[PDB]
């Protein structure tokens, strides 16, 4: 992603070094008083919350390249008691104190527009998820999450759209009601297991039940949307 | 709102004037290829998506002051086939072409942060809406909406905390909770009047048990505490 590679060099040329993380590590957590701006360059993470019970909740997924900010840019304070956990085997990330970021984004508007637009993609993603769930319920959410994975990691082949993604990580991403919905799609031959890999074979099925997330992808990632359309 | 009033001045000093919009008007629409940045200074609006079927989906709500951009600041293309409908009697908004915005947010950083901060409030608001819904479902969603309406439009009266809105439609109340049809909403509200959490009296909604709403809208209450601590402190 060109605009992301440019933001990478802009951070390095300004002295900011990357950092490695491993599965189940927290890049930022809900208890640190210091808030941070995260440039997830490589890997897959998830935003998590906790209730009074101590139930963990999964709220959002992020793949690199992308930006995640745990604090408001102006006040420099938490936007919510969230933790950012790595679920891939490794993840390369740049961690920036929010105050440090603003003098940094000031001296180059192009990178400001980059970060600014990542927030926009985030807003509309959540509204398309809500829109799809409002119509086709949890079955719409699952088909949407499958549609995203298909567009991002899918390669067209004779067996279908192979999800180029380790089966470990792919099993996690996809509650008891959640298990049954995924399997029924497997039952209906929407996504098939074959030769240690998973292939998507009824892309129209996913587009049908996650139509607003299919639009979000079209309006936000047209080039990635076009390869399989 | 200090930083919002300062954004108002910056626009008027650049030739951008306010515009009156009456109820049911669309400040931007999903069919207009021109995308805009909307600085809703006063009034109440809702984001909608209209299907070919002709059904209408209520996705988000905004009061002034706030900022709603229909296009991506960089590409200037649509972020989604959405409309911004006015649901208050009148509304006051500064309507800007996206390309003209990059020219202004360039010259001032301070404002650019302001609009940047609104986006952050949107994201964390949708995630808090979602969070409270996963734990407490439709009941929590409605509690959340009532709680925010209590914080923002709360006046202490002998009949509890009066929600100072007019024509405050029960259906518009459910649309904001993420609930489409009036059956479920009617059911939930019934249990709330029975449990003496709310009362429908002078054509209007009064809150009588604030702690109850906080109990089932914690993540949304935690959002307002972190997002609008001044307004949050009114009733805590
Ligand atoms: Na934090
Ligand atoms: Na194509
Ligand atoms: Na539009």
Residue numbers in the entry:
A (entry chain A): 2 to 175, 183 to 237
B (entry chain B): 2 to 237
The authors write:
The major regulator of virulence factors in L. monocytogenes is the transcription activator PrfA, a member of the Crp/Fnr family of regulators. PrfAWT is a homodimer in which each monomer consists of an N-terminal domain (residues 1 to 108) and a C-terminal DNA-binding domain (residues 138 to 237) linked by a long α-helix (αC, residues 109 to 137). Glutathione binding stabilizes the DNA-binding helix-turn-helix (HTH) motif in a conformation compatible with DNA-binding, thereby allowing expression of PrfA-regulated virulence factors.
In addition, we found three new PrfA mutants in the remaining three strains—Leu to His substitution at residue 140 (PrfAL140H), Ala to Gly substitution at residue 218 (PrfAA218G), and Ala to Val substitution at residue 94 (PrfAA94V). All the previously identified PrfA* mutants, i.e., PrfAG145S, PrfAG145C, and PrfAL140F, could grow in this medium with G-6-P, as could the PrfA mutants PrfAL140H and PrfAA218G, whereas the strain carrying the PrfAA94V mutation was unable to grow. The PrfAG145S, PrfAG145C, and PrfAL140F mutants showed the highest expression levels, followed by PrfAA218G and PrfAL140H. To gain a deeper understanding of the PrfA* mutant proteins, the crystal structures of purified PrfAL140H, PrfAL140F, and PrfAA218G were determined as individual proteins and in complex with the PrfA hly promoter DNA. We expected that the crystal structures of PrfAL140H, PrfAL140F, and PrfAA218G would be similar to the PrfAG145S structure, since our in vivo characterization classified them as PrfA* mutations. However, their structures showed that each of the PrfA* variants had only one folded HTH motif, with the remaining structure residing in the PrfAWT conformation. The PrfAL140H, PrfAL140F, and PrfAA218G PrfA* mutants all had a folded HTH motif in one monomer of the homodimer but an uncollapsed central core structure. Consequently, we suggest that these mutant structures represent an intermediately activated form of the protein with features characteristic of both inactive and activated PrfA. The most striking structural difference between the inactive, intermediate-active, and fully active structures is the position of their recognition helices.
